[PDB]
mmCIF file of C-alpha atoms in Angstrom:
data_model
loop_
_atom_site.group_PDB
_atom_site.id
_atom_site.type_symbol
_atom_site.label_atom_id
_atom_site.label_comp_id
_atom_site.label_asym_id
_atom_site.label_seq_id
_atom_site.Cartn_x
_atom_site.Cartn_y
_atom_site.Cartn_z
ATOM 1 C CA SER A 1 61.712 39.850 68.539
ATOM 2 C CA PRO A 2 62.456 43.536 69.498
ATOM 3 C CA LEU A 3 59.609 43.237 71.969
ATOM 4 C CA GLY A 4 56.773 40.754 71.583
ATOM 5 C CA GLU A 5 55.648 39.196 74.848
ATOM 6 C CA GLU A 6 52.137 38.266 73.770
ATOM 7 C CA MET A 7 52.895 34.975 72.056
ATOM 8 C CA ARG A 8 54.952 33.657 74.951
ATOM 9 C CA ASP A 9 51.835 33.497 77.097
ATOM 10 C CA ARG A 10 50.041 31.512 74.413
ATOM 11 C CA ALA A 11 52.640 28.781 74.711
ATOM 12 C CA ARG A 12 53.292 29.091 78.434
ATOM 13 C CA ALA A 13 51.335 26.017 79.474
ATOM 14 C CA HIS A 14 52.609 24.138 76.436
ATOM 15 C CA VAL A 15 56.026 24.384 78.072
ATOM 16 C CA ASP A 16 54.562 22.205 80.799
ATOM 17 C CA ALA A 17 53.588 19.624 78.203
ATOM 18 C CA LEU A 18 57.172 19.867 77.004
ATOM 19 C CA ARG A 19 58.796 18.931 80.301
ATOM 20 C CA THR A 20 56.759 15.746 80.535
ATOM 21 C CA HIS A 21 58.647 14.409 77.533
ATOM 22 C CA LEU A 22 62.114 15.246 78.809
ATOM 23 C CA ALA A 23 61.450 14.103 82.360
ATOM 24 C CA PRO A 24 64.152 11.334 82.069
ATOM 25 C CA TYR A 25 66.642 13.488 80.165
ATOM 26 C CA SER A 26 67.903 15.915 82.810
ATOM 27 C CA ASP A 27 70.650 13.794 84.325
ATOM 28 C CA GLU A 28 72.301 12.216 81.306
ATOM 29 C CA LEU A 29 74.108 15.003 79.483
ATOM 30 C CA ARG A 30 75.985 17.441 81.691
ATOM 31 C CA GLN A 31 79.332 15.889 82.527
ATOM 32 C CA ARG A 32 79.854 15.827 78.779
ATOM 33 C CA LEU A 33 79.258 19.567 78.906
ATOM 34 C CA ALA A 34 81.669 19.723 81.845
ATOM 35 C CA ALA A 35 84.640 19.115 79.548
ATOM 36 C CA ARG A 36 84.385 22.050 77.169
ATOM 37 C CA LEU A 37 83.281 24.157 80.113
ATOM 38 C CA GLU A 38 86.715 23.228 81.431
ATOM 39 C CA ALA A 39 88.465 24.918 78.526
ATOM 40 C CA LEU A 40 86.594 28.131 79.242
ATOM 41 C CA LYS A 41 87.491 28.524 82.899
ATOM 42 C CA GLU A 42 90.218 26.462 84.522
ATOM 43 C CA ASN A 43 90.829 23.354 86.594
ATOM 44 C CA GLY A 44 92.724 20.840 84.489
ATOM 45 C CA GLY A 45 96.455 21.395 84.175
ATOM 46 C CA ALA A 46 96.490 25.092 84.994
#
């Protein structure tokens, strides 16, 4: 994938199809990701 932006367009509307599945998934995993993200930055015992 050095530069191929032809195929992306093929599957551009299919990405719409894809969201419809994971409609109810957005707000379930993120606070779980907000624990390791803690290690990276700060906030949590200096």
